[PDB]
Amino acid sequence: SMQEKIMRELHVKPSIDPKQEIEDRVNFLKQYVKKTGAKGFVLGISGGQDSTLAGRLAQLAVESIREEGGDAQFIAVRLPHGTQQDEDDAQLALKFIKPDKSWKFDIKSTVSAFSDQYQQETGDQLTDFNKGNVKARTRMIAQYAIGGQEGLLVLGTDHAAEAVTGFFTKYGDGGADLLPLTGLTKRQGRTLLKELGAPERLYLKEPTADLLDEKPQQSDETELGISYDEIDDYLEGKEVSAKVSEALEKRYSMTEHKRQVPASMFDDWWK
Amino acid sequence: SMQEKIMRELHVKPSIDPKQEIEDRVNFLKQYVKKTGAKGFVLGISGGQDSTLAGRLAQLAVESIREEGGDAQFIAVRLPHGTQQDEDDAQLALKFIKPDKSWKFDIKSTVSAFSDQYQQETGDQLTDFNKGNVKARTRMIAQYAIGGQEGLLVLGTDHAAEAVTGFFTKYGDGGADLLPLTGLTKRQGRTLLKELGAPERLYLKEPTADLLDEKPQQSDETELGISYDEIDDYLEGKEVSAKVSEALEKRYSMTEHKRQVPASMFDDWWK
Ligand SMILES: Nc1ncnc2c1ncn2[C@@H]1O[C@H](COP(=O)(O)OC(O)C2=CCCN([C@@H]3O[C@H](COP(=O)(O)OP(=O)(O)OC[C@H]4O[C@@H](n5cnc6c(N)ncnc65)[C@H](O)[C@@H]4O)[C@@H](O)[C@H]3O)C2)[C@@H](O)[C@H]1O
Ligand SMILES: Nc1ncnc2c1ncn2[C@@H]1O[C@H](COP(=O)(O)O[C@@H](O)C2=CCCN([C@@H]3O[C@H](COP(=O)(O)OP(=O)(O)OC[C@H]4O[C@@H](n5cnc6c(N)ncnc65)[C@H](O)[C@@H]4O)[C@@H](O)[C@H]3O)C2)[C@@H](O)[C@H]1O
Ligand SMILES: [Mg+2]
Ligand SMILES: [Mg+2]
Ligand SMILES: [Mg+2]
Ligand SMILES: [Mg+2]
Ligand SMILES: [Mg+2]
What we know:
Two copies of one chain form a homodimer.
Chain A: H1 2-10, H2 18-36, E1 40-44, H3 49-67, E2 73-78, H4 87-97, E3 101-104, H5 108-122, H6 128-150, E4 153-154, H7 160-163, H8 186-195, H9 201-204, H10 220-224, H11 228-235, H12 242-254
Parallel strand pairs in A: 1-2, 1-4, 2-3
Helix pairs in contact in A: 2-3, 2-8, 3-4, 3-8, 5-6
The complex binds nicotinamide-adenine-dinucleotide-adenylate intermediate (2 copies) and magnesium ion (5 copies).
Pathway (chains A, B): Cofactor biosynthesis; NAD(+) biosynthesis; NAD(+) from deamido-NAD(+) (ammonia route): step 1/1
Binding site for ATP (chains A, B): 44-51, 78, 84, 157, 186, 208
EC number (chains A, B): 6.3.1.5
């Protein structure tokens, strides 16, 4: 079925061993640093589940490298746009991750400069939606600037429950160097956080991209019209209602471009 | 040999028919955009060879779509950082391209806001090299904002002679939706642009990324330490010095991450 195909392509298991998943994903981070001579990692810590998980895995990886006599560091970075309404949760995430370094970059003045220039040049105010994608891409710029200045790789938090819907900004939070969470469903990420001892508030809250000025903290499920339990059931190979398979297979097909390098005439996937 | 592998991976031909390259690449643009249902294309026009070529191909594609009774448009956009020293060549490129629409977005206030915030937040001056990548990524943001507002796809200008060296900013000018120039060597692209009727001032224009404040208009060759005709010889399967081949093969491996989606543990290309 298409469901089986999507599961295979997104690397999803129906059942996991959380300890082994953690080992595999920390080992990946370590191996990628060994092979490339990298100095460590940078990651935006939002106060949401995914960045909490990826941040703790990163911290464990750099600690393990150092325990082996090597050199590595992790910079966690707060990236509010002005006042972030769930700053408290982001601080709690930092308290749990216990990163080597905890930095901050408020993206609002950059986003405002851009938005104001856009109207000055075109006569048009950006739509809230398009401004939201400017925010996500500005966060990419901020992380790549810290990584470039400090000699580090940019982690991304994409996982299977965002990949299937294409629920990320292309060259925004989609723009990263390496991905410790690939293949995990949303529920599976919660299981890994539990194994790691995370505070439950960080995985009980609603997932949100929090990109819109007019609809702040909008839940992903509100935007998508599909819940993470539906997504996860699909991705874990459960026998789900036909409405879920219809919705997800359409979104997956429509967003393939986000999961491929830019298309050329030599590629066949898009035809 | 590794040369054969790279030539194949980058879709390079040893010999081309310039007129049919033009036909094929225009047709790619037509076929792709129609598949997506997008209204057309946006592209940053720097004055340089690659964007002049890709821009003219785009304009031909949209004109062909309209000739067959469809709807399509091309927005060419100037993206200076303040005063661009070779603005005159960019204006000449626009004159040659004859784009449907001609827009401008000056990135300087955005880049200055970012840079000033970086120093405020970190206590660290953003360095010229890292600021240059901020400029390239701000250009990406600008093109995606126009594209999102106007319903267009973002063209990229990557070609084999930049691809092999990774001579583009990751998620800057590398960030695009589709690539009409894939597989062309530098001199092959020049042949297309000449066949399209461009003046020598455009098709023999010295390549530059022009990203640095301390070294404006630096030529690519100054930065790379190798010239485009050596790169082109390698890519086209000619004999080159051990000097050239060792250097290009090492750089190709070191920059594979720029030619792949973000790495996960399920990928092996980095090993
Ligand atoms: N004024 C304009 N007006 C309108 N439009 C335009 C203008 N200017 C440009 N345009 C448009 O843009 C295109 C492109 O123009 P073009 O061809 O002239 O530009 C160019 O030539 C051009 C464009 C931009 C840049 N360049 C060069 O690239 C290098 C960047 O590498 P780099 O400086 O080192 O920076 P990077 O961020 O790309 O890569 C390093 C980062 O990568 C990650 N990393 C590293 N190793 C690694 C790994 N092993 N695994 C995983 N990740 C890893 C880390 O995060 C790390 O920090 C450095 O050498 C630069 O000088 C070139 C044109 O065709 C136009 O369309
Ligand atoms: N406050 C913070 N502090 C610190 N760190 C962070 C913060 N916030 C986030 N972070 C960090 O970021 C990550 C991610 O966080 P996360 O998981 O909560 O965010 C999120 O959930 C999140 C983040 C960003 C976005 N979302 C959603 O994606 C959609 C994007 O619109 P979209 O319309 O899908 O926009 P797009 O540009 O991504 O895609 C459209 C463009 O694609 C092109 N195109 C289209 N068709 C097509 C084709 N067939 N072929 C080729 N190209 C094609 C065209 O150019 C077209 O314009 C839209 O629905 C958005 O709401 C979600 C976190 O984990 C953190 O690491
Ligand atoms: Mg997320
Ligand atoms: Mg979130
Ligand atoms: Mg170029
Ligand atoms: Mg300092
Ligand atoms: Mg140039």
